[PDB]
Amino acid sequence: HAWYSHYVLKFFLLVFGENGVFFYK
């Protein structure tokens, strides 16, 4: 059972995604 496990994954994907999208030439 996990209802708040997607928030930590969705928020991380947004912050981790910008780290790669803002550093790939």
Side-chain angles (χ1 to χ4, degrees):
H1 249 105
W3 238 271
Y4 67 88
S5 219
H6 184 237
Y7 296 130
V8 66
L9 223 301
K10 192 72 210 185
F11 178 86
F12 197 101
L13 196 100
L14 198 143
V15 174
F16 197 78
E18 210 253 300
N19 261 279
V21 172
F22 213 78
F23 235 94
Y24 221 66
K25 270 189 154 171

